[PDB]
Design an enzyme around this catalytic site. Structure first.
Site, PDB file in Angstrom:
ATOM      1  N   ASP A 179      -1.223 -19.777   3.031  1.00 34.13           N
ATOM      2  CA  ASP A 179      -1.260 -19.026   1.743  1.00 34.13           C
ATOM      3  C   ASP A 179      -0.622 -19.822   0.585  1.00 34.13           C
ATOM      4  OD1 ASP A 179      -0.248 -15.636   0.643  1.00 34.13           O
ATOM      5  OD2 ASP A 179      -2.091 -16.729   0.199  1.00 34.13           O
ATOM      6  N   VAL A 207      11.443  -8.088  -3.594  1.00 36.30           N
ATOM      7  CA  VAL A 207      12.408  -9.172  -3.554  1.00 36.30           C
ATOM      8  C   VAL A 207      13.410  -8.931  -4.660  1.00 36.30           C
ATOM      9  CG1 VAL A 207      12.733 -11.732  -3.503  1.00 36.30           C
ATOM     10  CG2 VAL A 207      10.537 -10.651  -2.791  1.00 36.30           C
ATOM     11  N   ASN A 234       3.426 -10.050  13.212  1.00 38.88           N
ATOM     12  CA  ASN A 234       3.250 -10.733  11.928  1.00 38.88           C
ATOM     13  C   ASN A 234       4.556 -10.867  11.138  1.00 38.88           C
ATOM     14  OD1 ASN A 234       1.741 -12.185  10.051  1.00 38.88           O
ATOM     15  ND2 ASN A 234       0.662 -10.412   9.175  1.00 38.88           N
ATOM     16  N   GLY A 243       4.932 -15.662   4.956  1.00 35.20           N
ATOM     17  CA  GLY A 243       4.232 -14.491   5.549  1.00 35.20           C
ATOM     18  C   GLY A 243       2.897 -14.739   6.270  1.00 35.20           C
ATOM     19  N   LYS A 282      14.292 -10.336   0.441  1.00 33.82           N
ATOM     20  CA  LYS A 282      13.097  -9.522   0.499  1.00 33.82           C
ATOM     21  C   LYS A 282      13.389  -8.362   1.423  1.00 33.82           C
ATOM     22  CE  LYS A 282       9.457 -10.446   3.163  1.00 33.82           C
ATOM     23  NZ  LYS A 282       8.251 -10.318   4.009  1.00 33.82           N
ATOM     24  N   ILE A 306      13.007  -9.039  -8.563  1.00 35.67           N
ATOM     25  CA  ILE A 306      12.233 -10.171  -9.041  1.00 35.67           C
ATOM     26  C   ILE A 306      10.810 -10.198  -8.528  1.00 35.67           C
ATOM     27  CG2 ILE A 306      14.287 -11.597  -9.595  1.00 35.67           C
ATOM     28  CD1 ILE A 306      13.967 -13.126  -7.094  1.00 35.67           C
ATOM     29  N   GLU A 337       2.575  -5.417  -1.730  1.00 36.95           N
ATOM     30  CA  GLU A 337       1.923  -4.421  -0.890  1.00 36.95           C
ATOM     31  C   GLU A 337       2.822  -4.010   0.278  1.00 36.95           C
TER      32      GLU A 337
END
Ligand SMILES: O=C(O)CCn1c2ccc(O)cc2c2c3c(c(-c4ccccc4)cc21)C(=O)NC3=O
EC number: 2.7.10.2
Length: 256
Positions: free
Chosen positions: A133, A23, A49, A152, A38, A15, A19
Protein backbone atom coordinates in the site's frame (compact mmCIF):
# COMPACT_ATOMS: atom_id res chain seq x y z
CA UNK A 1 -10.73 2.03 33.32
CA UNK A 2 -7.63 4.16 33.73
CA UNK A 3 -6.22 2.85 30.45
CA UNK A 4 -2.48 2.36 29.87
CA UNK A 5 -3.16 4.87 27.09
CA UNK A 6 -4.67 7.40 29.50
CA UNK A 7 -2.15 6.82 32.21
CA UNK A 8 1.08 6.75 30.17
CA UNK A 9 0.31 9.37 27.53
CA UNK A 10 -1.09 12.88 27.22
CA UNK A 11 -3.14 13.01 24.01
CA UNK A 12 -2.39 16.27 22.14
CA UNK A 13 -4.35 16.08 18.89
CA UNK A 14 -6.04 13.80 16.45
CA UNK A 15 -3.88 13.58 13.32
CA UNK A 16 -5.55 10.84 11.34
CA UNK A 17 -8.85 9.07 10.83
CA UNK A 18 -9.94 6.01 8.91
CA UNK A 19 -12.36 3.20 8.20
CA UNK A 20 -10.87 1.43 11.24
CA UNK A 21 -9.26 3.73 13.80
CA UNK A 22 -7.74 7.10 14.50
CA UNK A 23 -4.17 8.28 15.04
CA UNK A 24 -3.27 10.71 17.80
CA UNK A 25 -0.23 12.83 18.51
CA UNK A 26 0.63 12.03 22.14
CA UNK A 27 3.30 12.85 24.65
CA UNK A 28 4.51 9.89 26.76
CA UNK A 29 4.50 11.23 30.31
CA UNK A 30 7.55 9.33 31.44
CA UNK A 31 9.98 9.98 28.65
CA UNK A 32 8.82 13.43 27.39
CA UNK A 33 8.73 12.27 23.71
CA UNK A 34 6.03 12.65 21.13
CA UNK A 35 4.61 9.56 19.44
CA UNK A 36 1.94 8.74 16.94
CA UNK A 37 -0.56 6.26 18.46
CA UNK A 38 -3.17 4.50 16.36
CA UNK A 39 -6.19 3.31 18.32
CA UNK A 40 -8.50 0.95 16.52
CA UNK A 41 -11.45 -1.32 17.38
CA UNK A 42 -10.25 -4.79 18.52
CA UNK A 43 -11.47 -7.43 16.01
CA UNK A 44 -11.03 -13.82 13.21
CA UNK A 45 -9.41 -13.11 9.84
CA UNK A 46 -9.72 -9.42 10.73
CA UNK A 47 -7.58 -10.14 13.83
CA UNK A 48 -4.99 -12.00 11.77
CA UNK A 49 -4.77 -8.91 9.53
CA UNK A 50 -4.45 -6.55 12.51
CA UNK A 51 -1.70 -8.70 14.05
CA UNK A 52 0.34 -8.87 10.88
CA UNK A 53 0.68 -5.08 11.17
CA UNK A 54 2.11 -5.55 14.69
CA UNK A 55 4.37 -8.42 13.52
CA UNK A 56 5.63 -6.37 10.54
CA UNK A 57 6.47 -3.43 12.86
CA UNK A 58 8.31 -5.55 15.36
CA UNK A 59 10.75 -6.71 12.60
CA UNK A 60 10.99 -3.47 10.64
CA UNK A 61 12.25 -1.26 13.59
CA UNK A 62 15.81 -0.64 12.49
CA UNK A 63 15.55 1.34 9.28
CA UNK A 64 15.91 5.09 8.77
CA UNK A 65 13.22 5.07 6.02
CA UNK A 66 10.57 3.09 7.83
CA UNK A 67 8.58 4.62 10.72
CA UNK A 68 9.94 3.09 14.02
CA UNK A 69 7.73 0.98 16.24
CA UNK A 70 7.78 1.31 20.03
CA UNK A 71 4.86 -0.68 21.48
CA UNK A 72 1.48 -2.28 20.85
CA UNK A 73 -1.15 -3.41 23.41
CA UNK A 74 -4.86 -4.26 23.73
CA UNK A 75 -7.24 -2.65 26.21
CA UNK A 76 -10.97 -2.23 26.43
CA UNK A 77 -12.21 -3.18 23.01
CA UNK A 78 -9.33 -1.43 21.30
CA UNK A 79 -5.93 -2.27 19.82
CA UNK A 80 -3.16 0.39 20.06
CA UNK A 81 0.15 0.83 18.22
CA UNK A 82 2.69 3.46 19.37
CA UNK A 83 4.98 4.59 16.56
CA UNK A 84 7.62 7.25 15.83
CA UNK A 85 5.95 10.65 15.25
CA UNK A 86 6.99 12.42 12.04
CA UNK A 87 6.54 16.16 12.45
CA UNK A 88 6.50 17.02 8.69
CA UNK A 89 3.16 15.35 8.04
CA UNK A 90 2.40 13.04 5.12
CA UNK A 91 3.70 13.26 1.59
CA UNK A 92 0.09 13.55 0.46
CA UNK A 93 -0.32 16.78 2.50
CA UNK A 94 2.94 18.28 1.02
CA UNK A 95 1.74 17.35 -2.51
CA UNK A 96 -1.73 18.89 -1.92
CA UNK A 97 -0.16 22.20 -0.75
CA UNK A 98 2.21 22.14 -3.78
CA UNK A 99 -0.76 21.56 -6.01
CA UNK A 100 -2.50 24.78 -4.85
CA UNK A 101 0.72 26.81 -5.00
CA UNK A 102 1.84 25.55 -8.46
CA UNK A 103 5.31 24.72 -7.22
CA UNK A 104 6.08 20.92 -7.14
CA UNK A 105 9.06 18.73 -6.13
CA UNK A 106 11.88 19.54 -8.55
CA UNK A 107 13.89 16.75 -10.29
CA UNK A 108 16.58 16.78 -7.56
CA UNK A 109 13.92 16.46 -4.83
CA UNK A 110 12.03 13.70 -6.74
CA UNK A 111 15.32 11.74 -7.04
CA UNK A 112 15.80 12.09 -3.24
CA UNK A 113 12.22 10.90 -2.55
CA UNK A 114 12.67 7.99 -4.98
CA UNK A 115 16.04 7.00 -3.44
CA UNK A 116 14.89 7.33 0.20
CA UNK A 117 11.66 5.31 -0.15
CA UNK A 118 13.60 2.93 -2.47
CA UNK A 119 16.00 2.25 0.44
CA UNK A 120 13.03 1.64 2.78
CA UNK A 121 11.60 -0.76 0.17
CA UNK A 122 14.99 -2.51 -0.12
CA UNK A 123 15.00 -3.07 3.67
CA UNK A 124 11.39 -4.39 3.74
CA UNK A 125 11.96 -6.64 0.77
CA UNK A 126 15.21 -7.99 2.28
CA UNK A 127 13.01 -9.25 5.12
CA UNK A 128 10.87 -11.35 2.73
CA UNK A 129 8.02 -8.92 3.26
CA UNK A 130 6.16 -6.61 0.86
CA UNK A 131 4.29 -3.41 1.76
CA UNK A 132 1.34 -3.54 -0.69
CA UNK A 133 0.00 0.00 0.00
CA UNK A 134 2.75 2.46 -1.00
CA UNK A 135 1.17 5.92 -1.70
CA UNK A 136 1.76 9.55 -0.62
CA UNK A 137 -0.54 9.37 2.44
CA UNK A 138 1.54 6.40 3.77
CA UNK A 139 4.84 8.23 3.42
CA UNK A 140 5.83 10.50 6.29
CA UNK A 141 8.20 13.41 6.47
CA UNK A 142 10.71 14.19 9.17
CA UNK A 143 17.73 17.27 5.24
CA UNK A 144 14.14 16.08 4.76
CA UNK A 145 13.62 12.41 5.65
CA UNK A 146 10.94 10.33 4.05
CA UNK A 147 9.75 7.23 6.01
CA UNK A 148 7.36 4.47 4.87
CA UNK A 149 4.53 3.91 7.31
CA UNK A 150 1.13 2.30 7.59
CA UNK A 151 2.10 -1.39 7.68
CA UNK A 152 -1.60 -2.45 7.53
CA UNK A 153 -1.19 -4.35 4.22
CA UNK A 154 2.24 -5.93 4.85
CA UNK A 155 2.50 -9.62 4.03
CA UNK A 156 5.22 -12.21 3.32
CA UNK A 157 6.65 -12.08 -0.23
CA UNK A 158 5.35 -15.54 -1.27
CA UNK A 159 1.83 -15.09 0.24
CA UNK A 160 -0.87 -16.86 -1.78
CA UNK A 161 -3.53 -14.44 -0.46
CA UNK A 162 -3.02 -10.68 -0.38
CA UNK A 163 -5.00 -7.64 0.76
CA UNK A 164 -5.05 -5.26 -2.22
CA UNK A 165 -3.77 -1.68 -1.58
CA UNK A 166 -5.19 1.63 -2.88
CA UNK A 167 -6.75 1.26 -6.30
CA UNK A 168 -4.97 4.39 -7.67
CA UNK A 169 -1.53 2.75 -7.07
CA UNK A 170 -2.40 -0.83 -7.75
CA UNK A 171 -0.50 -2.86 -10.38
CA UNK A 172 -2.64 -4.84 -12.79
CA UNK A 173 -1.14 -8.25 -12.04
CA UNK A 174 -2.10 -7.90 -8.39
CA UNK A 175 -5.67 -6.94 -9.35
CA UNK A 176 -5.57 -10.08 -11.57
CA UNK A 177 -4.62 -12.20 -8.50
CA UNK A 178 -1.14 -12.92 -9.84
CA UNK A 179 1.20 -12.84 -6.88
CA UNK A 180 4.35 -14.22 -8.45
CA UNK A 181 6.32 -10.93 -8.26
CA UNK A 182 4.84 -9.05 -5.27
CA UNK A 183 7.88 -6.81 -4.65
CA UNK A 184 7.38 -5.27 -8.10
CA UNK A 185 3.88 -4.15 -7.07
CA UNK A 186 5.64 -1.96 -4.45
CA UNK A 187 7.97 -0.62 -7.21
CA UNK A 188 5.00 0.22 -9.44
CA UNK A 189 3.27 2.10 -6.56
CA UNK A 190 6.51 4.00 -5.76
CA UNK A 191 6.74 5.23 -9.36
CA UNK A 192 3.15 6.56 -9.28
CA UNK A 193 3.86 8.13 -5.85
CA UNK A 194 6.80 9.99 -7.45
CA UNK A 195 4.58 11.11 -10.35
CA UNK A 196 2.12 12.60 -7.85
CA UNK A 197 5.02 14.45 -6.15
CA UNK A 198 6.09 15.74 -9.63
CA UNK A 199 2.80 17.71 -9.84
CA UNK A 200 0.44 15.30 -11.67
CA UNK A 201 -3.37 15.52 -11.61
CA UNK A 202 -5.03 13.16 -9.04
CA UNK A 203 -4.74 9.59 -10.22
CA UNK A 204 -7.68 7.60 -11.61
CA UNK A 205 -9.43 5.00 -9.38
CA UNK A 206 -10.92 3.04 -12.34
CA UNK A 207 -11.94 3.50 -16.00
CA UNK A 208 -9.89 4.14 -19.13
CA UNK A 209 -7.18 6.44 -17.69
CA UNK A 210 -6.52 3.67 -15.14
CA UNK A 211 -5.90 1.00 -17.84
CA UNK A 212 -3.66 3.24 -19.96
CA UNK A 213 -1.26 3.74 -17.03
CA UNK A 214 -1.22 -0.04 -16.51
CA UNK A 215 -0.24 -0.25 -20.21
CA UNK A 216 3.00 1.45 -19.02
CA UNK A 217 2.09 5.04 -19.97
CA UNK A 218 3.17 7.70 -17.48
CA UNK A 219 0.54 10.29 -16.56
CA UNK A 220 1.23 13.89 -17.59
CA UNK A 221 3.75 15.75 -15.35
CA UNK A 222 3.64 19.62 -15.45
CA UNK A 223 7.40 20.10 -15.45
CA UNK A 224 10.40 19.18 -17.62
CA UNK A 225 12.39 16.14 -16.41
CA UNK A 226 15.56 14.55 -17.78
CA UNK A 227 14.88 11.81 -20.26
CA UNK A 228 16.93 9.39 -18.15
CA UNK A 229 14.72 10.04 -15.07
CA UNK A 230 11.45 9.84 -17.07
CA UNK A 231 12.66 6.55 -18.55
CA UNK A 232 13.34 5.15 -15.04
CA UNK A 233 9.79 6.07 -13.97
CA UNK A 234 8.39 4.49 -17.12
CA UNK A 235 10.21 1.18 -16.58
CA UNK A 236 9.01 1.06 -12.91
CA UNK A 237 5.47 0.96 -14.37
CA UNK A 238 6.16 -1.62 -17.12
CA UNK A 239 3.16 -3.99 -17.55
CA UNK A 240 5.67 -6.86 -17.21
CA UNK A 241 6.63 -6.94 -13.52
CA UNK A 242 9.94 -8.64 -14.30
CA UNK A 243 11.07 -5.59 -16.29
CA UNK A 244 10.58 -3.23 -13.33
CA UNK A 245 13.68 -2.74 -11.27
CA UNK A 246 14.10 -4.49 -7.89
CA UNK A 247 14.50 -2.12 -4.93
CA UNK A 248 18.21 -3.03 -4.71
CA UNK A 249 18.59 -2.25 -8.44
CA UNK A 250 16.62 1.00 -8.00
CA UNK A 251 18.83 2.21 -5.12
CA UNK A 252 22.07 1.48 -7.14
CA UNK A 253 20.67 3.06 -10.32
CA UNK A 254 22.97 5.51 -12.08
CA UNK A 255 20.17 8.13 -12.29
CA UNK A 256 20.07 8.20 -8.43
O1 LIG B 1 -4.23 10.43 7.84
C1 LIG B 1 -3.09 10.29 7.35
O2 LIG B 1 -2.89 9.91 6.17
C2 LIG B 1 -1.88 10.57 8.22
C3 LIG B 1 -2.19 10.56 9.72
N1 LIG B 1 -0.83 10.64 10.29
C4 LIG B 1 -0.08 11.78 10.48
C5 LIG B 1 -0.37 13.14 10.23
C6 LIG B 1 0.60 14.08 10.55
C7 LIG B 1 1.84 13.72 11.06
O3 LIG B 1 2.73 14.73 11.31
C8 LIG B 1 2.20 12.35 11.29
C9 LIG B 1 1.16 11.44 11.00
C10 LIG B 1 1.15 10.00 11.13
C11 LIG B 1 2.11 9.00 11.63
C12 LIG B 1 1.76 7.60 11.60
C13 LIG B 1 0.43 7.22 11.14
C14 LIG B 1 0.01 5.82 11.14
C15 LIG B 1 -0.56 5.13 9.98
C16 LIG B 1 -0.97 3.70 10.18
C17 LIG B 1 -0.82 3.09 11.38
C18 LIG B 1 -0.33 3.73 12.48
C19 LIG B 1 0.07 5.06 12.43
C20 LIG B 1 -0.48 8.17 10.64
C21 LIG B 1 -0.16 9.52 10.67
C22 LIG B 1 3.00 7.00 12.16
O4 LIG B 1 3.09 5.74 12.29
N2 LIG B 1 4.01 7.87 12.48
C23 LIG B 1 3.48 9.10 12.13
O5 LIG B 1 4.10 10.15 12.35
Amino acid sequence: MKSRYTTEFHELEKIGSGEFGSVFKCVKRLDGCIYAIKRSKKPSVDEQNALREVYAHAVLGQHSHVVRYFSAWAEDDHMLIQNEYCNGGSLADAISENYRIMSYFKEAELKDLLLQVGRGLRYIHSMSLVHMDIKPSNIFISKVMFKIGDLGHVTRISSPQVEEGDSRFLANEVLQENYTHLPKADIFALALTVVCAAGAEPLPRNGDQWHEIRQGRLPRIPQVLSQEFTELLKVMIHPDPERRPSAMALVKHSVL
